[PDB]
Design an enzyme around this catalytic site. Structure first.
Site, PDB file in Angstrom:
ATOM      1  N   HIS A 403     -19.904 -24.520 -28.023  1.00 40.81           N
ATOM      2  CA  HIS A 403     -20.247 -24.931 -29.390  1.00 40.81           C
ATOM      3  C   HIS A 403     -21.768 -24.990 -29.538  1.00 40.81           C
ATOM      4  O   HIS A 403     -22.351 -26.067 -29.704  1.00 40.81           O
ATOM      5  CB  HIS A 403     -19.604 -26.282 -29.739  1.00 40.81           C
ATOM      6  N   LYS A 486     -16.349 -18.234 -36.709  1.00 41.56           N
ATOM      7  CA  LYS A 486     -16.324 -19.651 -37.063  1.00 41.56           C
ATOM      8  C   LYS A 486     -15.910 -19.824 -38.508  1.00 41.56           C
ATOM      9  O   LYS A 486     -16.522 -19.250 -39.410  1.00 41.56           O
ATOM     10  CB  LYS A 486     -17.719 -20.249 -36.837  1.00 41.56           C
ATOM     11  N   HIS A 488     -16.027 -22.602 -41.218  1.00 38.43           N
ATOM     12  CA  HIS A 488     -16.770 -23.844 -41.440  1.00 38.43           C
ATOM     13  C   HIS A 488     -16.656 -24.274 -42.891  1.00 38.43           C
ATOM     14  O   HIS A 488     -16.797 -23.449 -43.797  1.00 38.43           O
ATOM     15  CB  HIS A 488     -18.244 -23.667 -41.077  1.00 38.43           C
ATOM     16  N   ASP A 490     -18.657 -25.711 -44.779  1.00 35.01           N
ATOM     17  CA  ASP A 490     -19.880 -25.413 -45.535  1.00 35.01           C
ATOM     18  C   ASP A 490     -19.879 -24.010 -46.152  1.00 35.01           C
ATOM     19  O   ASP A 490     -20.599 -23.758 -47.119  1.00 35.01           O
ATOM     20  CB  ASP A 490     -21.131 -25.617 -44.673  1.00 35.01           C
ATOM     21  N   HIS A 515     -14.066 -25.703 -38.149  1.00 39.71           N
ATOM     22  CA  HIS A 515     -14.532 -26.993 -38.643  1.00 39.71           C
ATOM     23  C   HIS A 515     -13.833 -27.122 -39.999  1.00 39.71           C
ATOM     24  O   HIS A 515     -14.121 -26.353 -40.921  1.00 39.71           O
ATOM     25  CB  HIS A 515     -16.059 -26.941 -38.785  1.00 39.71           C
ATOM     26  N   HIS A 541     -15.012 -30.139 -32.429  1.00 42.45           N
ATOM     27  CA  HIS A 541     -15.116 -31.573 -32.664  1.00 42.45           C
ATOM     28  C   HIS A 541     -13.827 -32.089 -33.284  1.00 42.45           C
ATOM     29  O   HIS A 541     -13.793 -32.462 -34.457  1.00 42.45           O
ATOM     30  CB  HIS A 541     -16.304 -31.884 -33.575  1.00 42.45           C
ATOM     31  N   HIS A 589     -27.016 -35.600 -44.747  1.00 47.55           N
ATOM     32  CA  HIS A 589     -26.294 -35.178 -45.945  1.00 47.55           C
ATOM     33  C   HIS A 589     -26.896 -35.751 -47.228  1.00 47.55           C
ATOM     34  O   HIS A 589     -26.320 -35.596 -48.306  1.00 47.55           O
ATOM     35  CB  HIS A 589     -24.814 -35.557 -45.829  1.00 47.55           C
ATOM     36  N   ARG A 605     -15.699 -40.674 -42.672  1.00 50.84           N
ATOM     37  CA  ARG A 605     -15.967 -39.664 -41.639  1.00 50.84           C
ATOM     38  C   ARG A 605     -16.371 -40.250 -40.278  1.00 50.84           C
ATOM     39  O   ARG A 605     -16.019 -39.691 -39.238  1.00 50.84           O
ATOM     40  CB  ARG A 605     -17.008 -38.639 -42.122  1.00 50.84           C
ATOM     41  N   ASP A 629     -22.629 -28.942 -29.617  1.00 54.47           N
ATOM     42  CA  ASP A 629     -23.009 -28.961 -31.042  1.00 54.47           C
ATOM     43  C   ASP A 629     -24.538 -29.019 -31.167  1.00 54.47           C
ATOM     44  O   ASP A 629     -25.081 -29.677 -32.061  1.00 54.47           O
ATOM     45  CB  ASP A 629     -22.329 -30.110 -31.810  1.00 54.47           C
TER      46      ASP A 629
HETATM   47 NI    NI Z   1     -18.839 -28.602 -37.225  1.00 52.29          NI
HETATM   48 NI    NI Z   2     -21.343 -27.370 -35.002  1.00 49.61          NI
END
Ligand code: NI
Ligand code: NI
Ligand code: NI
Ligand code: NI
Lengths: 836, 836
Positions: A403, A486, A488, A490, A515, A541, A589, A605, A629
């Protein structure tokens, strides 16, 4: 100033010393690292003053810091401090032996040159031995089952003669007199690598044992060259007489055999403590891992006691002795790692490791078949063989971090210096997309990242952006070189994107990393699970602080087609974890504590209950992988340390595992090492190349002192060549004087790194020879066999508990049972080791 | 913080300053390096405070340190301190001129910003000029044997006009009026590179001399372009009139010739002191080498006084003047080193050095044949020629260290920064085998090491493991690229191995290096000598502290077929040598002082008497080479310094050598420089490429300030391009403001290093084109002519005394005479220079 590199370096050392001095001055009990810095700096400073000799400073250095001025472990960890400095008579080396020798140091001397106030001794306010070896109080018999003889040996020389353990005794210096006939085919029955000394005129009785294996004499004086037999004995004795080698018949010399018998006068014994000191521990012995509570027991040993491969002056690995003359040049090992304690998911064992063509060629008993029993043809040490000394050390596979956000190059250096040799993830540098997600989106960037990293001595895999509802662009990033994708949130982690991405994976034989939708925007966790449609997927994660369906993403740990990983920052639950994570999230964030909805999101979270559950799920093998990460929400240099800190915490709070024996922690150790070695390799489809200490795989290997296991390795070997290692002052007479730092080695220069490593790509990419297209020097191989994997394929981490999470209280249960553990107030592998 | 590189660097400088401040505060008399750090840091700190101007700080900087606060040499060494800092009005440069101007400094100002207590002046408790030039008190006549004229020159301009020494005088600014006819073919009779200034309305009389060589005028205003003759004179005068260049006949202007005559009014003279200041010293002048007792006398000079090649504004190397227009582009030098003092085993001389295609093209008088006498066609400076300014500096060959353990890459950087351009040895990185022995054992490792070092701007040779009784594997490492083999006792240095290895060497034309049997296990020193069977062999660390037959290995220095070297740490015998070496050995070999046999071994190997003998044997030329033993038992950055420290000690204790004249140390200097230049090259078989400042060889050259000779060079030139050099603040307005450090230059970037260097291999390796096989960019050449060498082939180090060593007392004799020298309490090239 005209500063040379060493002057720049010694200034750095002095600065570390001054930091340690300031800390000492306020009453800080110094750790190992600070103590080394202070003592070394003080020796340099006294050298500058020019009033003290090397001999005087050897003494003075022992008076600087007392037991009360350092942490409990420091007197154990600190055997010596070495530094070189410019004296009035030039550069000299000072070694301070066993520097912590008193209760209280002479603190005026500790602070000499600093102009700092000397603290009163009451300022220092008020145990575990890191890396300790535990053994039974008993001796071991050497060289059993051999013919033996006791001979009187007299020196007729006028200068000293010393003879090593594996020297062919008939071949010794002609100025020794003894029964050369009875010495034929024999060697000294003494601990491997030791010697017997003969001063002029000395007579000493020595015990000799027969050489074994093929029983062929080579080298020395060429007195008795050839296989041991009657014809060659007579030839040898003719040569002894003709060349004037000392010979006198000893008709009544005692003759017999060695055996398992404490009363046999032909036997030589060695206590387990001394054995471990010379060769590292053996079967049944235990090793403490760093300063943790974990004990590793040696399960088996390939050594035949007395024939250990030790390299050095008068030692075993020498021409005709432990170094073979009877084999084809092509079968010589490239390198042997001698006397290694191997810790691997496959077992905790003691063995030599053979390396050839950058691969692990063999694991077992190395040496010379002409004089030793039990040496197979793939473990031969020849003239063309290098030696790495493993005695007293632990060897593991290089770690695999799967990761990785490729945010900067500097995290690569931090990774390898910690013991990581394979990186898998995505990125393009510090762009917003990469800072958020493990994605190398454009084929242009895929090419550039493969080219950028081509000379770095690590294996690399790059993942593209899998967040698309259409297959068209995904095909393109895959053929460009992506070895995975990946998904994600986002970029969108919707059921439509999930389904499409997985369909692509089924076609391309690549792993998908996910994710999930934290916002539950398109669905809850069950809806993402439904979108998997039973297909193999890697959940990043999995606990969810790093991202995922709030509050119950952790449910994936009970899903058969999920391969679940943890990222590091939550490992393990400690006193500061929640406060740290909540603020980190809200800063990253741009969430406002004054805005109710923002705070509600943050609390949904970052959850104490799920992080606590993550500790337990890792321990029972329901989470299979630990990863960084890196610089997105985790720490690249702490993949290994955080794994061991989790294991240590769980042993402390729950005791030994179900499958562990009462005497050691071997099962827990094997389960946990799998999390950063074999399982990342299986999940990503390159387990035939890396991920464990097994024959045929790349020789990506890490050397550890037991006292520093899990924090700071000694040496990182990449494809059989040293890539990074601890090295001191480059100008010094030896490699160990301060400052000792983790530094890049010859495996990092020119194009050497590419020769030692693999860039992992998709089959589609390899089918078009992307390495040729991109002009890569690094070997390329296709990932494979990742679409039929289940949780059951995760080695020692194959648990599938039914996980429930209360939506209101966040209470986590496994198979109806509460998953809870307290916060830890401290962790090992921390304060004992780090300067900051 | 958003730190830029310069901010990181200035922090380092400040830290060095603070170290110097702490030392000052306890009463330390600061050395040159510390003084620079303190003064520069203080200027930065006052700039930060914003209350002082640049002008004010130029003054304040002279008040910080007095003569009593610094070492005796510092006022001599310290001409200026420069640094840039952010003032309220931005970045500005401050130069503090001659900072040590008072007896005692204003120590409150020296310690400003440090918060350290200001020491009383009585804390500083109570000479040689490093690099000093000695010359006769006498002047030299310029430009002898030329036609001369004295002309009145009047400026009719309204702005200043300045004319350089080698400008064609008829070509000057039309607003000067004089007799242009009498100026035709003439130039100013003034020191080369100086100028005459004419303010508006000025009349000055000037002396002109004829241009020489081919006598061709080029450039300027193109008034008088062409060879000097009657036709071109008339053409020039027509142009003077037509274009309105100032002309007035001076019918009675004095005309004559220059000659050796102190009373000739046409002559221009310059004192030797001023000459040396401008151009470096000349014939008969003497130079102190660093802060040693050694004096080098210039034996000859190729310069014709007045025609020196100096580059700069108004100076000699300009279009049509010292820079030639009359030659084919292909014969322009690539680079000229102007006005170099060359110190080489071949002689101590003054000359220009021409470089072309990375080779030394020529040594002698450079310039333009059109205006200068004595310029050969291989020494022409053209438009396409770079200039390196050698005036005031010493140039030597790059050093060659032929006992290198390749333990880490960082020792390579330390080596080149000290003035070493060729490394010969063995290793694979910090593996046990390499830490002990100069061996690259496997063909795999030979390939990888050649590839690893391919972009580094040094020449490399790698040696394999020669310790085998069979030839089979030795053939393989040699064809893989080994240019030599090491016999080492740690792999077995038995007579059988010795004989086999030498037989291999006879076939392959490679050198064998040996570390003998210290233990006398297979034989005494005479038995190893017998095993040589009269064949050429290089004995490493011949004195024996570094390894070898105890106690009498040093006997090899009297054997004709032996080429003996020393390693560095024993050089020379000083107060701390024995204590340092004994402990080093016992730590490295895990020897116990409490165990009688261990201590007996240690004392048998570390011997005051043999180290003392080693001093004398080096001085009389019975040891031929000095080398490092880098990080095994020696110091890579001290090959050069330890050589000169040995020479200095021996002069101090025995006076001038037999072959030295009474006035200088030239013979000793030449003997000693041979030890780290030509002799390593001869011994290893690449002396046609490197090892001396001679035409046809690689331009591997090192520039030294006399005051720093033997410690810290200015610039390291590799194959004609700067590879490493002293450079200050990269953001600064000039290259000299602090911090000045040895730094890698353009020769270290991309693949430039390979283009500038050679990897030396065996003929067998070259026969199979190993460079093509391994994809090397660096040039490869085969070693040769090493199997017929004797001690007599070691330049200026060819002595063969009969050496005896008493086995009981260790007393060493040469030809029956005692070899003894006292311990030195101090050495030069140490405390004056190093920060730590
Ligand atoms: Ni992530
Ligand atoms: Ni990550
Ligand atoms: Ni040696
Ligand atoms: Ni050596």
């Amino acid at each position: 100033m005209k500063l040379s590199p060493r002057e720049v370096e010694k200034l750095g050392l002095h600065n570390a010393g001054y930091l340690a001095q300031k800390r000492l001055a306020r009453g800080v009990r110094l750790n190992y690292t600070e103590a080394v810095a202070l003592i070394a700096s003080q020796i340099m400073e006294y050298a500058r003053d020019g009033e003290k000799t090397v001999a005087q400073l050897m003494c003075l250095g022992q008076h600087l810091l007392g037991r009360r001025q350092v942490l409990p472990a420091v007197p154990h960890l600190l055997n010596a401090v070495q530094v070189e400095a410019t004296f009035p008579d030039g550069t000299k080396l000072v070694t301070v032996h066993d520097p912590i020798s008193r209760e209280n140091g002479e603190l005026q001397e500790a602070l000499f040159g600093s102009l700092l106030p000397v603290p009163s001794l009451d300022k220092f306010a008020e145990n575990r031995i890191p890396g300790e070896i535990l053994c039974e109080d008993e001796c071991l018999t050497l060289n059993i089952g051999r013919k033996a003889v006791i001979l009187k040996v007299t020196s007729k020389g006028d200068r000293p003669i010393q003879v090593g353990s594996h020297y062919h005794f008939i071949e010794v210096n002609p100025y020794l007199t003894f029964d050369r006939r009875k010495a034929y085919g024999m060697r000294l029955n003494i601990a491997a690598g030791t010697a017997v000394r003969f001063e002029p005129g000395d007579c000493k009785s020595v015990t000799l044992v027969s050489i074994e294996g093929n029983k062929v004499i080579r080298g020395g004086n060429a007195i008795a060259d050839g296989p041991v037999n009657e014809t060659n004995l007579e030839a040898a004795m003719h040569a002894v007489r003709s060349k004037g080698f000392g010979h006198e018949e000893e008709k009544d010399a005692s003759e017999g055999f060695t055996k398992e018998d404490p009363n046999c006068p032909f036997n030589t014994f060695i206590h387990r403590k001394e054995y471990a000191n010379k060769y590292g521990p053996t079967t049944g012995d235990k090793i403490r891992l760093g300063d943790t509570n974990l004990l590793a027991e040696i399960e088996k040993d390939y050594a035949l006691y007395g024939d250990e491969c030790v390299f050095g002056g008068g030692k075993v690995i020498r021409d005709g002795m432990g170094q073979s003359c009877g084999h084809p040049p092509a079968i010589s090992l490239d390198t042997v790692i001698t006397n290694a304690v191997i810790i691997d998911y496959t077992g905790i064992i003691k063995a030599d490791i053979g390396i050839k063509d950058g691969l692990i060629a063999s694991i077992g008993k190395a040496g010379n078949p002409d004089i030793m029993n039990g040496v197979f043809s793939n473990m031969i040490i020849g003239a063309n063989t290098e030696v790495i000394a493993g005695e007293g050390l632990i060897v593991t596979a290089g770690a695999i971090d799967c990761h990785v956000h490729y945010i900067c190059p500097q995290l690569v250096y931090e990774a390898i210096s910690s013991g990581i040799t394979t990186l898998v993830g995505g990125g393009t540098g510090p762009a917003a997309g990469t800072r958020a997600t493990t994605c190398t989106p454009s084929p242009t960037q895929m090419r550039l990242m493969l080219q950028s990293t081509d000379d770095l001595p690590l294996n690399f895999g790059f993942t593209g952006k899998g967040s698309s509802s259409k297959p068209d662009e995904l095909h393109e990033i895959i053929k460009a070189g992506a070895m995975g994708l990946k998904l994600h949130e986002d970029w969108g982690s919707t059921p439509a994107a999930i389904d499409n991405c997985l369909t692509i994976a089924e076609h391309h034989d690549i792993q998908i990393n996910i994710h999930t939708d934290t916002l539950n925007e398109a669905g809850f966790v069950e809806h993402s699970i439904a979108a998997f449609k039973g297909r193999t997927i890697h959940t990043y994660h999995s606990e969810g602080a790093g991202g995922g369906h709030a509050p119950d993403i952790i449910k994936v740990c009970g899903i058969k087609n999920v391969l679940p990983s943890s990222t590091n920052p939550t490992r393990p639950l400690t006193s500061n974890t929640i406060d740290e994570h909540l603020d980190m999230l809200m800063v990253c964030h741009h969430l406002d504590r004054e805005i109710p909805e923002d705070l509600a999101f943050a609390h949904s979270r970052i959850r104490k209950k799920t992080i606590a559950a993550e500790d337990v799920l890792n321990d029972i093998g329901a989470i299979s992988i630990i990863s960084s990460d890196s610089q997105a929400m985790g720490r690249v240099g702490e993949v290994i340390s955080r794994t061991w800190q989790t294991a240590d915490k769980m042993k402390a709070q729950t005791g030994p595992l179900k499958c562990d024996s009462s005497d050691n922690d071997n099962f827990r150790i094997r389960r946990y090492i799998a999390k950063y070695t074999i399982n990342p390799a299986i999940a990503n489809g390159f387990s035939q190349y890396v991920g464990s200490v097994e024959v045929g795989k790349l020789a990506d290997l890490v050397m550890w002192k037991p006292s520093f296991f899990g924090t700071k390795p000694e040496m990182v070997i990449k494809g059989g060549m040293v890539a990074w290692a601890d090295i001191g002052d480059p100008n010094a007479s030896i490699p160990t004087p301060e400052p000792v730092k983790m530094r890049p080695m010859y495996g990092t220069l020119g194009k050497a790194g590419g020769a030692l490593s693999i860039a992992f790509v998709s089959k589609a990419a390899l089918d078009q020879r992307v390495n040729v297209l991109y002009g890569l020097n690094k070997r390329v191989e296709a990932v494979s066999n990742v679409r039929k994997l289940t949780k059951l394929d995760m080695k020692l981490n194959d648990a599938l508990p039914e996980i429930t999470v209360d939506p209101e209280s966040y209470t986590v249960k496994a198979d109806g049972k509460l998953l809870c553990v307290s916060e830890a107030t401290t962790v090992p592998l921390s304060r004992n080791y780090f300067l900051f």
